[PDB]
Amino acid sequence: MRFKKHVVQHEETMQAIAQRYYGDVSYWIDLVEHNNLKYPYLVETDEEKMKDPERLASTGDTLIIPIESDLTDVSAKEINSRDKDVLVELALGRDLNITADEKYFNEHGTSDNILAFSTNGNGDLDTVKGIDNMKQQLQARLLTPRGSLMLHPNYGSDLHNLFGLNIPEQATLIEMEVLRTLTSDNRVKSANLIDWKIQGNVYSGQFSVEIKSVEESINFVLGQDEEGIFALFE
């Protein structure tokens, strides 16, 4: 359950609150009954509240409005930018950093024993969040051979076998495999080719990845509020 809570403003009235929330002043008596207020409902200052602290409320006190509120179906324009950042951080998840030392496992991408855990410098395990978490997950999926991970036959990629000839056919095979790998992730909305080239022994390419927008992540997390898990099991 969840209800709205209203702070008493300067020289406010119960009719104004009822109009603001319920859309009609008629509910001010219901608001009085629910909050158990005496006739001077909103006193000028705390000196008057001292006369009867139980039954009276002064400026700065909090009233309860029993309207069933729900975090979903809330306009994202009202949400603060920091709140949006935290929401997308929750949506993309938090995971222990393993892709530290980018140079090492970029030099030995196809081999095992390439990545390892790391510390955050404060004595605790390192963590990657949001875009860093997505980077880590996508790098791990691309580097992982398909079928090598226990309990997950489909997770990984076939790039270890696509060290073929230097022709456009193998380049297309690589591109298709990479697109399959990126599309395998549920968070990746779509991926597509940008540009590629061949320099004899070396193949080079780059891709564009469009993660789920801020609106979709906000909606997902705020809908998760009904369950309270706030965790990812994709």
Partner: protein
């Protein structure tokens, strides 16, 4: 299994983690490393607990399996029914097995049937026939006077009645009784001793209790069923079982216990006189029947014990109790037993 606990496992994990690196030094509550190691150590603790429990269970299972000492299941109630005729018979009427007996008393709608054929001689006024409850368990332990219908539809029948409350019906065996009889088995591996004779007499499931009375060169085995009777078939079965256990060259005899049937008529006063009715009477009668039937061999009836048993039903609601047929305690010998007869209660 050494029965480790969670704190020691977590401390050992953290200590080795600290030893292996000086970088990790934050194991406060809410940290990732502490949570992970706590979860691992908790799973290990649950594994150890369940392993200990499973080993205990497997010891019991191995004991059962090695000796083939199967646990006894629920027993169906059985008893005898009296049947009366208008006049002495002339035809030797035949009653086949499966003849169903029922009761109009809706409180006890269980059914009974004969497992063996019977014959009533000419110039005979009544016959006693043994019957078995169709349903297993305690549900067949009806009180006296319940069975009053025979489904055969014979016109010669005057009336049907079971003269005593059935008690042989029981649920599945308890763990303690199973362990007790396993101890008896172990004791009775030596065949020729008194305990071994007692086990052999108790080897038959239907036998409730046995008292081995011993003399010079003679053995008397007093045995009884749950109802305190000892049928000829059960006597023969006990003898056949005792052939393996009894000592050679010593006379042995099997006889039924000296069963004594007690009739109880109790006048009880009730403080709240609106509670008077058939339910309270039947409940008190059931309590009295249970108390009388729970008496073992060599258990002396004490009137005050029965008084407190009746009064503890509800000390406030029940005001006073008086017995119209009992005045003094009954002494039961070692080879005797008390069983309930006709139980009646009057509410005032």
């Amino acid at each position: 299994m050494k029965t480790r606990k969670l704190t020691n496992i977590l401390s050992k994990l953290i200590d080795k983690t600290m030893a292996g690196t000086s970088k990790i030094t934050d194991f406060t509550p809410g940290s990732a490393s502490r949570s992970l190691l706590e979860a691992v150590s908790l799973e290990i603790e649950q594994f150890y607990i369940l392993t200990k429990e499973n080993i205990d269970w497997g010891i019991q299972e191995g004991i059962i399996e090695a000796f083939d000492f199967q646990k006894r299941q629920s027993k169906r109630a059985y008893g005898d029914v009296t049947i009366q005729f208008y006049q002495p018979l002339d035809m030797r009427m035949y009653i086949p097995a499966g003849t169903t007996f029922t009761s109009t008393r809706q409180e006890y709608p269980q059914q009974f049937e004969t497992l063996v054929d019977y014959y009533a001689e000419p110039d005979s006024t009544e016959i006693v026939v043994e019957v078995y409850c169709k349903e297993t368990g305690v549900a067949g332990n009806v009180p006296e006077g319940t069975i009053n219908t025979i489904a055969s539809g014979s016109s010669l029948i005057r009336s049907v009645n079971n003269e005593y409350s059935f008690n042989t019906g029981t649920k599945e065996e308890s763990q303690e009784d199973f362990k007790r009889r396993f101890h008896s088995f172990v004791e009775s591996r030596g065949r020729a001793t008194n305990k071994s004779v007692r086990y052999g007499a108790l080897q038959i499931p239907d036998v409730e209790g046995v008292y081995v009375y011993e003399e010079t060169g003679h053995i008397t085995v007093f045995a009884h069923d749950r109802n305190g009777n000892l049928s000829d078939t059960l006597k023969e079965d006990i003898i056949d079982a005792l052939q393996d256990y009894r000592p050679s060259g010593i006379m042995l005899d099997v006889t039924g216990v000296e069963k004594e049937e007690v009739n109880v008529s109790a006048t009880v006063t009730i403080s709240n006189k609106s509670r008077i009715g058939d339910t309270l009477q039947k409940h008190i009668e059931s309590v009295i029947r249970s108390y009388l039937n729970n008496l073992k061999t060599s258990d002396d009836l004490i009137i005050t014990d029965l008084i407190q048993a009746i009064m503890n039903i509800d000390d406030v609601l029940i005001y006073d109790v008086s017995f119209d047929n009992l005045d003094e305690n009954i002494i039961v010998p070692p080879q005797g037993i008390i069983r309930a007869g006709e139980i009646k209660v009057e509410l005032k």
